[PDB]
Design a binder for these strands. Sequence first.
RNA 1: GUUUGACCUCAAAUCAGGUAGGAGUACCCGCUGAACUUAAUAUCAAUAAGCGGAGGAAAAGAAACCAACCGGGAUUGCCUUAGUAACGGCGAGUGAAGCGGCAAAAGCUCAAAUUUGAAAUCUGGUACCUUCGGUGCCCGAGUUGUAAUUUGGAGAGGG
RNA 2: GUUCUUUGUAAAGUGCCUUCGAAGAGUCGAGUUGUUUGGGAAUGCAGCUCUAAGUGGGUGGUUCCAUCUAAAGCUAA
RNA 3: AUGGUGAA
Lengths: 108, 108, 71, 119, 177
Amino acid sequence: VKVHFDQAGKKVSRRNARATRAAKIAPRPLDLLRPVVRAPTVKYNRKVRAGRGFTLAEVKAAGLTAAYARTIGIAVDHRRQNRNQEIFDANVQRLKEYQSKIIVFPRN
Amino acid sequence: RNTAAETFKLFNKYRPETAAEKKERLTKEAPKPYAVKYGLNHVVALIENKKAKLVLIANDVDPIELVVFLPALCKKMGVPYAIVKGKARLGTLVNQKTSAVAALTEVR
Amino acid sequence: SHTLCNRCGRRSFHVQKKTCSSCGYPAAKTRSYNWGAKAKRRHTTGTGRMRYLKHVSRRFKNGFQTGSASK
Amino acid sequence: AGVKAYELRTKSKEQLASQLVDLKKELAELKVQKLSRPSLPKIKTVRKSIACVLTVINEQQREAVRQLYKGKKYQPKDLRAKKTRALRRALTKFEASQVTEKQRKKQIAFPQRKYAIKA
Amino acid sequence: GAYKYLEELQRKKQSDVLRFLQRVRVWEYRQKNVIHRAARPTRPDKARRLGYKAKQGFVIYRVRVRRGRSLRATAEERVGRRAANLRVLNSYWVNQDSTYKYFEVILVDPQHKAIRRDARYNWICDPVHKHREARGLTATGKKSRGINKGHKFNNTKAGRRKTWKRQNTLSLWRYRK
RNA sequence: GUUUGACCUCAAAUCAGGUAGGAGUACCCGCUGAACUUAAUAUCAAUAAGCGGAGGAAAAGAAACCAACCGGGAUUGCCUUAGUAACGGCGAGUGAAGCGGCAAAAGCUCAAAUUUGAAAUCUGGUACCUUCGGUGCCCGAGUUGUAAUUUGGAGAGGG
RNA sequence: GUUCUUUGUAAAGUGCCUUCGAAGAGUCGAGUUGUUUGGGAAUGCAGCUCUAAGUGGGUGGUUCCAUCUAAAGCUAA
RNA sequence: AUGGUGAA
Ligand SMILES: [Zn+2]
């Protein structure tokens, strides 16, 4: 029989790891900008949730290269379809807002 | 009998630039070259493209599959092809152990 | 009927069979089984001198450094 | 009384050998006389001196071997580090950091930038 | 790539030339030991796609297995038991007989400086890959284990023992649900 | 030229560089593999024990996937899905998975497309240097393919 | 940050025009005999005979459709 | 039942 007596210790360790990652990668937010996705399983279709990454078409509409999006903390999914237009427009607007808000530190 | 010897002697005047000759030329330097063809891959690439003008195929290639299909393709493309013995002599004239093929395009 | 064993000296070497029932001599692999809990504890490392294994932890803690202190 | 490493190391090989022979003779004499004394720290002192002399001789031999094998690769295993078998394997820093040309070009083209997101 | 023609020829395995070659090669192999070295693979098209390269370090073994556990996996384990210092990268059938099957196995020498410095192939030098054939991590081992995506392999997606332990081991939290 | 020089195969070296044994085994990966107890066979149980191989984690991992909606989108771990579907003397019992919520997220490398206007690649020996390696030279592997771009997420030839 | 330095007709990509653009075979699969499994229409796996194609093939839901490109490999959390 | 031991 397994008992999760360590729950508190695991939570503390996770918090410490998050703090260490924040210290290491301070400029970044420790996560990646991700799209807004409508769920399958009509029982949950009305629910709107995030996705793995933006599509290649979405990246092209945003006007940046896929590799540049990868290095600028934008998650890109190369296998996601584009069978909707409202979601595509929302993702494009979100990507544009994120790109406008971000500031890139130069080597100077 | 003597035909093979004469062919090998003629090919000895089309010897590919060996490592020593390449090093000597580079040192001296510190109108494209014409030489026989040895690599099977690029020989086959020239075949079916008609850049090849003469082909000799080794008769004692252990992977007989490597040479069974070559005569058929040569006949289909009309490129003069023949069977040749003496893989040791082929290697000597190619500046390698063996080549299994000897093709020529820019015959003077 | 038995005799001292070179590998272990447990005095469980059969003359008529030329083998040790305790440690499995002269078998290349030392005899061991899961059902023998007490035997496993008896034959497990740390019961002997551990001439070399003792300092492995110290060497790891020191990082396998080389040379000498510069005072 | 006794000997010191910083003094012994300055002597030559022949001098060290002569000192070792003399100390061995003294140790033998003290062992013979042991049956006529209740205490004998002198024997312990000479034993420690002999041990120090032998250690100095071994160090001199090892440094001579190291000088002989200096520079040339594939030196005798006795000089190589005994870190562990698992560390003799586990390819060294250069091999581990080696990267293919395609990956190097991709990384140079698109390096991982650093950026804050507040404005 | 000339290897495409060789692959196309090998696709029609029932050709007269291929039958001749197979019946010659089986007899030729029957005169040699059960497991032996080979200078180069007899199926370069297979070897190239399986990852074999002409550079130093790679080794080719030919192994005969009695006909009548995957035969490829058994051959890989047998060759690994002999070539302890080698890592069995891949294996593939090359000939068969009424009572014997012939497999050509490609292995890599992790101790070779070429492989060690080859970033594209130095991954096998990791000790985690030691005795890869013994754990069925090769293609044949994975196929035998049935670790593939899809409903067909749901019950063995992460090992039968692991899934049994996970689905038959009770778990309790500090606060009961 | 009844020599000689090459390639292929097989052998010898107390020649140079190494590698594998075994132990340990709580966790991992495969093979083999029982019994009592229960409504040979379901069940016990794909457990007990035996065999082989790894690390600090292992395995798996970026779909020939999940779904039938205006679709999702590596693997792994937890609540729920659930004691439901389903299986099963429909009894006794066995028994999941998509979706939903959270922890952490990173994708890449080849067979494949002549470099043929230049085997350009790489292993090893020696002399040096600023020695987890670099340069000059030599030797060897390699054309039965070592170099470079690239894997449909595409990609390449020209403007 | 000290700043040491450099090169090289340097390398890659973006947008348009534009000519091309090969998908891993004794392998999937089918039939048989066994192993395992509560496996839904004996699956997963092995032995046995056969073993196919490229705008083609695999998995599913109604004859038609939806979805991916296996039979090669690596990867911390 | 599994794995080993000695043996007129
Ligand atoms: Zn013993």
